[PDB]
């Protein structure tokens, strides 16, 4: 996350870290939507050009974490994955349309002050909050900057990072890139000279873009960190998987496969 700040304790209790088992490695962000289901980006699991291609036996997740580099005894939980599911129409060989995947935990994780599910949007929430200018929140342990110098690397924070960003008008998103944009994605970020900056970055893929409903006070996961061209460049924006638009598939998986 570029230009973000440290998360407060328990600020994003649905935050999940996706790791490759061996060699052990932090791969992507993800989110908890129930005691047995985790949401992430399809490209985190299946995407050859980025050394991504894994089944449930290649991965594990850590839930309830705040600091990347410290073992948080009696707070963090670890879990194997029973199975992974990728949207059947997920398109990697072009623009990553329907960049979404679900992962079922081998056992239910216990909720606590630090582990708690985020809500998925219904039509009314989507219709009322997905408006240009309305802000959402993106979180992750991804890189702090797109570039590196001889003395300063891209940077990997130890503490979870968070940034608030405004949803952008679709025509602006479209004109900012040559990559085709579908109705299964939306973009967010500040325009040049709105002053503020901020963006998700390498390593934040799969993490959530959440909005706090002023109607019932609950946090809803409106998007998934999907793609971008570099990080926090002027005139560029982050793209996110449109969760509500893929709700039918999400429901099918949970209903058809459990928990």
């Amino acid at each position: 996350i570029v230009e973000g700040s440290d998360a407060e304790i328990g600020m994003s209790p649905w935050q999940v870290m996706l790791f490759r088992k061996s060699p052990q490695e932090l791969l992507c962000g993800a989110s908890l939507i129930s005691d047995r289901w985790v949401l992430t980006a399809a490209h985190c699991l299946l995407y050859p050009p980025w050394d991504k291609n894994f089944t449930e036996n290649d991965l594990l997740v850590r839930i309830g974490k705040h600091s990347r580099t410290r073992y948080e005894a009696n707070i963090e939980k670890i879990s194997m994955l029973e199975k992974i599911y990728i949207h059947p129409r997920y398109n990697w060989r072009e623009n990553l349309d329907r960049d979404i995947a679900l992962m079922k935990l081998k056992k239910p994780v216990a909720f606590s002050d630090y582990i708690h599910p985020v809500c998925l949007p219904d039509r009314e929430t989507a219709a009322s909050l997905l408006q240009a200018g309305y802000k959402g929140r993106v979180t992750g342990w991804g890189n702090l900057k797109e570039t590196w110098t001889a003395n300063v690397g891209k940077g990997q924070p130890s503490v979870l990072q968070v940034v608030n960003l405004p949803i952008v008008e679709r025509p602006v998103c479209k004109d900012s890139t040559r990559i085709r944009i579908t109705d299964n994605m939306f973009c967010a970020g500040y325009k040049p000279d709105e002053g503020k900056r901020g963006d998700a970055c390498e390593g934040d893929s799969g993490g959530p873009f959440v909005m706090k409903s002023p109607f019932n006070n609950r946090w809803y996961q409106m998007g998934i960190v999907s793609w971008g061209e570099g990080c926090d460049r002027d005139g560029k924006y982050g793209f996110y998987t449109h969760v509500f638009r893929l709700k039918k598939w999400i429901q099918k998986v949970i209903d058809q496969f459990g928990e």
Binding site: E8, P13, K135
Partner: peptide
């Protein structure tokens, strides 16, 4: 929807995090 989206250390305790107000204010601007 169960108890989704209500954080134990914030909403459940009537405490607001440091930046959620910026989110709320954006539904006006």
């Amino acid at each position: 929807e169960a108890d989704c989206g209500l954080r134990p250390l914030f909403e459940k305790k009537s405490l607001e995090d440091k930046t959620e107000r910026e989110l709320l204010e954006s539904y006006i601007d």
